[PDB]
Amino acid sequence: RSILLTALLALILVYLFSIVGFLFLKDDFILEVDRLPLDSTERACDTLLMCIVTVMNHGLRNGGGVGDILRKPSKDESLFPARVVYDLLFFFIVIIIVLNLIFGVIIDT
Amino acid sequence: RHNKQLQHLLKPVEDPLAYYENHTSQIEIVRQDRSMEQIVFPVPGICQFLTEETKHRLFTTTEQDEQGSKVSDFFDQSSFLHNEMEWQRKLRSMPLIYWFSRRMTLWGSISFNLAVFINIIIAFFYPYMSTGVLDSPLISLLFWILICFSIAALFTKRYSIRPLIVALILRSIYYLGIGPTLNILGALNLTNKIVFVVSFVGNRGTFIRGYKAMVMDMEFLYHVGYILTSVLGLFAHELFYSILLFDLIYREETLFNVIKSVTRNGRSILLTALLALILVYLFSIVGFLFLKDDFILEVDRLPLDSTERACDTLLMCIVTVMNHGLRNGGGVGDILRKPSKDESLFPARVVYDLLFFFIVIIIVLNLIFGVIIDTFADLRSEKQKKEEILKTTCFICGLERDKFDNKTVSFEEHIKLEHNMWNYLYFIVLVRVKNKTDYTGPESYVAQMIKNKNLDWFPRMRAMSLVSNEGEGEQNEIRILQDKLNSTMKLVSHLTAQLNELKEQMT
Amino acid sequence: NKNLDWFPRMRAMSLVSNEGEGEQNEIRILQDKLNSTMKLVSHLTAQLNELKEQMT
Ligand SMILES: Nc1ncnc2c1ncn2[C@@H]1O[C@H](COP(=O)(O)OP(=O)(O)OP(=O)(O)O)[C@@H](O)[C@H]1O
Ligand SMILES: [Ca+2]
Numbered sequence: 230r231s232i233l234l235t236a237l238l239a240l241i242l243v244y245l246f247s248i249v250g251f252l253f254l255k256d257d258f259i260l261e262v263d264r265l266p267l268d269s270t271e272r273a274c275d276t277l278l279m280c281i282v283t284v285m286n287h288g289l290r291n292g293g294g295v296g297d298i299l300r301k302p303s304k305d306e307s308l309f310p311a312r313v314v315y316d317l318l319f320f321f322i323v324i325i326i327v328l329n330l331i332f333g334v335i336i337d338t
Numbered sequence: 339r340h341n342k343q344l345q346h347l348l349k350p351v352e353d354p355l356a357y358y359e360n361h362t363s364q365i366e367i368v369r370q371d372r373s374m375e376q377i378v379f380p381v382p383g384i385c386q387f388l389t390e391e392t393k394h395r396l397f398t399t400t401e402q403d404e405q406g407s408k409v410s411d412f413f414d415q416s417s418f419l420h421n422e423m424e425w426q427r428k429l430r431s432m433p434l435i436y437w438f439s440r441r442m443t444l445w446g447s448i449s450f451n452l453a454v455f456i457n458i459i460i461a462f463f464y465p466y467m468s469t470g471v472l473d474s475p476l477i478s479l480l481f482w483i484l485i486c487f488s489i490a491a492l493f494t495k496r497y498s499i500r501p502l503i504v505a506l507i508l509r510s511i512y513y514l515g516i517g518p519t520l521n522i523l524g525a526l527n528l529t530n531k532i533v534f535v536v537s538f539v540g541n542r543g544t545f546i547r548g549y550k551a552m553v554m555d556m557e558f559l560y561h562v563g564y565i566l567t568s569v570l571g572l573f574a575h576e577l578f579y580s581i582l583l584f585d586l587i588y589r590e591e592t593l594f595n596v597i598k599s600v601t602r603n604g605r606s607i608l609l610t611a612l613l614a615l616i617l618v619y620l621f622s623i624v625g626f627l628f629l630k631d632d633f634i635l636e637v638d639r640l641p642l643d644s645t646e647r648a649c650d651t652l653l654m655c656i657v658t659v660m661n662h663g664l665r666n667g668g669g670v671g672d673i674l675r676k677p678s679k680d681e682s683l684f685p686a687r688v689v690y691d692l693l694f695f696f697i698v699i700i701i702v703l704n705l706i707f708g709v710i711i712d713t714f715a716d717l718r719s720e721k722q723k724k725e726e727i728l729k730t731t732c733f734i735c736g737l738e739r740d741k742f743d744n745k746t747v748s749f750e751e752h753i754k755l756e757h758n759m760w761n762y763l764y765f766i767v768l769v770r771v772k773n774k775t776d777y778t779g780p781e782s783y784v785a786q787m788i789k790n791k792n793l794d795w796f797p798r799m800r801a802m803s804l805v806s807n808e809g810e811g812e813q814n815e816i817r818i819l820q821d822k823l824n825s826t827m828k829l830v831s832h833l834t835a836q837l838n839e840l841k842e843q844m845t
Numbered sequence: 846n847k848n849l850d851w852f853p854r855m856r857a858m859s860l861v862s863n864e865g866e867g868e869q870n871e872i873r874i875l876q877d878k879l880n881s882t883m884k885l886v887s888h889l890t891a892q893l894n895e896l897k898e899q900m901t
């Protein structure tokens with residue numbers, strides 16, 4: 230039960246981050262795809278379910294969080310501080326805290 | 339207690355005996371001479387207006403004292419319980435407000451379910467106007483799984499209404515559509531929030547007094563704020579419904595434990611973060627002074643070189659370090675230009691990277707957030723301990739279930755009839771309400787103890803059922819002491835008689 | 846009667862065979878005290894009987 234509740238909390242946080250990205254960072258969700266034997270890049274966060282799936286998969290499977298897949302910004306862009314804050318918050322909240330809290334109980338038991 | 343026939347005839351079976359048994363209560367008290375006696379009293383009518391929600395809260399909220407007794411807090415809450423019962427009795431006159439307030443739990447539960455369903459539907463079908471999931475086969479598989487779960491209701495175990503409501507909502511989406519379903523759910527949620535706030539106001543009874551206090555109450559502010567959020571979600575934009583999940587997080591105990599753990603160790607976290615910031619600042623200074631050219635970052639410019647110099651100023655170095663080095667397992671060295679063995683500063687780069695990795699990544703980062711995990715584990719352990727002790731220990735006396743192993747009375751009977759916290763509360767209310775002139779011996783003693791603020795009249799690790807069988811064992815050293823006292827008295831009497839005889843002979 | 850007290854609990858005959866001397870320490874003192882009390886009671890009763898006989 231504790232694992233399920235913590236997973237639901239992680240899902241809630243992922244949903245909030247996906248909403249924020251869709252509303253303010255739609256263009257930065259560009260992913261690289263190796264198409265089977267037609268551009269090599271596709272826009273992932275077009276709908277909302279796609280943003281949620283891409284976050285929950287890549288951000289959780291990447292040590293640095295969701296910021297390791299998003300387009301790399303430049304210092305001259307207006308939303309560079311917003312991107313920095315977004316990435317740091319995601320890394321500190323979802324990767325460092327919730328992920329460990331979900332599965333520490335298993336090791337302890 | 340001494341006649342079997344009377345006990346047989348006093349069993350309940352409009353029924354007089356049943357009515358008297360229902361309106362009669364009994365408790366056990368300790369007198370000033372350390373003797374336990376049973377007091378049987380009638381339940382006053384006012385005690386019938388105590389809410390089961392209040393009972394449940396008073397049960398699973400009390401905290402043990404240093405010794406391990408909840409009687410202090412239970413007694414201290416007696417005045418609040420009496421006031422709440424009086425207010426409920428007053429509210430009983432009003433039909434509409436009482437009718438709305440009776441079902442406060444139902445309103446909250448259905449509002450919770452509505453919020454969850456609305457968020458799920460928004461996530462699965464926003465934006466709308468592709469609706470790929472509407473035709474994808476996975477939705478059919480989920481529908482079949484929910485149908486199987488609903489059919490499994492024959493085994494009970496609850497968790498059956500919710501999948502049924504989910505299936506109903508899915509069918510409504512299929513037939514009417516997505517937008518109409520969302521509008522209906524939002525309207526229902528708004529109406530439910532209004533009803534719930536009305537019920538809360540009625541239960542708390544702040545409306546009878548000026549509305550200023552009602553508006554001042556923090557919980558009222560919370561409810562009105564979430565009502566504003568709900569109306570914003572209904573009218574301005576659908577995505578505003580996501581804010582409702584904060585209410586769910588706060589309501590759920592396990593989820594709120596994470597926030598509690600984070601808040602409890604707030605100062606330590608802030609200080610450790612400041613230490614990390616200091617280290618990042620020092621590393622940024624060193625890099626700017628001696629490794630300016632190695633801070634080259636790759637940028638995918640929007641539709642003009644692909645590389646830029648990051649550590650030109652100092653704030654840029656600090657930001658790039660704090661972001662990339664902390665978000666990269668290998669540290670800051672995974673973004674910097676790769677040096678060659680023939681470069682003069684290759685050893686300096688190696689030392690810089692190794693020091694950063696060993697100091698900031700391996701030590702400070704873990705030290706910042708280990709406290710949160712430790713506190714969460716401790717809170718879970720404490721909750722489990724409290725739940726375990728609440729189901730295997732008497733609230734009043736504190737005896738464990740193991741004692742009632744083979745005795746004629748089980749632990750369930752002991753907690754239901756003999757030691758009932760609610761019966762003790764009823765006795766306290768009866769003492770407080772009944773006139774002083776009509777007090778009996780036990781009632782006057784209890785009133786005096788209450789006035790003196792002494793809680794020794796509650797039973798502490800003692801039960802009449804247990805002592806009835808333990809009397810033989812207890813009366814072991816007492817008999818020896820009595821025999822010794824009798825022997826000493828006989829010796830004293832013999833000595834006095836001898837002295838009197840000697841005095842008479844001398845005279 | 847569903848009583849399990851007939852099983853041995855932290856007791857063994859092999860151990861008690863050697864621990865008997867140590868165990869019989871307070872028991873002897875208690876027996877001596879009881880004997881002294883009984884002797885005192887008997888002496889008091891005899892004195893009372895003698896006093897009653899003299900008075901009669
Ligand atoms: N001293 C106690 N120790 C442990 N649990 C107790 C104690 N006193 C009450 N309880 C809890 O309260 C329950 C009895 O409460 P209460 O008499 O209000 O129940 P009820 O369902 O309203 O009764 P009924 O409908 O039969 O009149 C017990 O089953 C137990 O759950
Ligand atoms: Ca009188």
Ligand SMILES: [Zn+2]
Binds near residue numbers: 733752
């Ligand atoms: Zn008891």
